[PDB]
Every structure is written in structure tokens, then in C-alpha cells.
């Protein structure tokens, strides 16, 4: 009944994708307790640094990536959820169930990527455990694994970026293809359609 409805609690940073020197590694910021708290006040007063976020709600943890000044992730993973901050939850700033794209403001102290002119078809894929696979790009929105992995090494990793040599951001890890429990493609957003939708 009315009184007793529930409110889903808000998204929550936990960790990051450190890329900053010459090792990627996976660093957590916040502990299950904390994000749980977290989640239902929406108040998360820890620093932010970085280009890749690990976020956590009470049931799913992926990861959320920043472009252009817009922390992106995937709505299967977000929902139409606010995200803590500071100052209390934020408010989605883009959210399109169409494209499995949702986006807020980027938290102060994230570091943005810069979104990919290059043309190029040899990308990175950033894991939520800071392993750097190549993927080769296919298509708009597609890209083959150059090493075939199972499933359970990529879940988890939707919202992460794929990147070019140069290090700009090409896609949105969305979905992965597999054969026999075996991870040969990948679905990502393109940067593109990010752009679009800002
Ligand atoms: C599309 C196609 C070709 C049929 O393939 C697949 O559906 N395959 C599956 C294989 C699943 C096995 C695990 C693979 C592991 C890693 C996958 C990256 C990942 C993940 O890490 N999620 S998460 O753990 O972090 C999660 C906690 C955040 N995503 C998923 O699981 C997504 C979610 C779900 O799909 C979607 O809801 N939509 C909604 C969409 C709307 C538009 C476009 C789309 F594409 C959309 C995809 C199925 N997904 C796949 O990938
Ligand atoms: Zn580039």
C-alpha cells in the first residue's frame, strides 16, 4: 500500500579503473556497508578520481565511464536510478532504454575521456578488473575479441570504455556475444551516439 512503498536507493561509486600510470589496476574506494548506506541516503562525501568508475546498486555492480563531462553507463544496469554525490542523489541527465545508455553530470574530481576522431579499428576494452583486452572493431557498434574469453570474465564490465590507441573513447560496453559459454564479440555504444544524445 501507498505508506509502505519502497524507494530503489541511488547508484553508487565503489571503486575505479586506475589508468593513470604505466599499470592499470582495479582500486576499491568503498566497502559493501557503506555503499549500502550510501545507496539509501545518496550522500557519498569520498573523492573521485579517474576516468572509470566501479558503481555498485544493493544488487548489481558494473562500471560508469566519463565523457565529455557526462559519467556514462548502461540502463541495465542503472535503471532510471540518481546517482550519490556530496550534496545528495543527482538526477539522470540522459537516459535512452534504446540504446542501454544512461548519463549524469560527472562528479567533481573525475577525469574525462575525450571521444575518438580517429577512424580507427584497433580498441581496447577496460575490464572492471583492469585487464586491457584488444578487440578488433566490426562494425558501428561491434567488436571481436582477439583472444576469446568465457562469459564470466567480461560480467560486470558493462558501462566500461573501449578505446583507441591514442586513448580515446570509442564505445560503451553494452552486451556480449557468445558461443558455448565463450565470449567471441562484443555490443558497445558508439561514441557517436553519445554525442548525438548530448
Ligand atoms: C545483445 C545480444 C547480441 C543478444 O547479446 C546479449 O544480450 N548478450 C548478453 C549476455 C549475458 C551474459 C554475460 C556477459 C557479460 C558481460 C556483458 C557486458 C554485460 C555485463 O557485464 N553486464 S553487467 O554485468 O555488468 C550488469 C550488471 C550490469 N552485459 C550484459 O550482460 C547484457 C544485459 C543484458 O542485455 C540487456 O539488458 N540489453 C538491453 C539492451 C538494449 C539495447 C541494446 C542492447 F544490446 C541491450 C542489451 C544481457 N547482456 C549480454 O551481454
Ligand atoms: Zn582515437
Partial sequence: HMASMKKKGSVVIVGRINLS??????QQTRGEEGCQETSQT???????????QIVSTATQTFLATS???VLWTVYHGAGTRTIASPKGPVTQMYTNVDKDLVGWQAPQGSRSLTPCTCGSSDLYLVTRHADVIPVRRRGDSTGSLLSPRPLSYLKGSSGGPLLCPAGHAVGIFRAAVSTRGVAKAVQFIPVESLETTM
Avoid at 21 to 26: K, L, Q, S, V
Avoid at 44 to 51: A, F, S, T
Wanted: a negative charge; hydrophobic letters at 25%.
Fill in 21 to 26: 600510470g604505466d599499470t592499470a589496476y582495479a
Fill in 42 to 52: 545518496g550522500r557519498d562525501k569520498n573523492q573521485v578520481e579517474g576516468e572509470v
Fill in 67 to 69: 565523457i565529455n563531462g
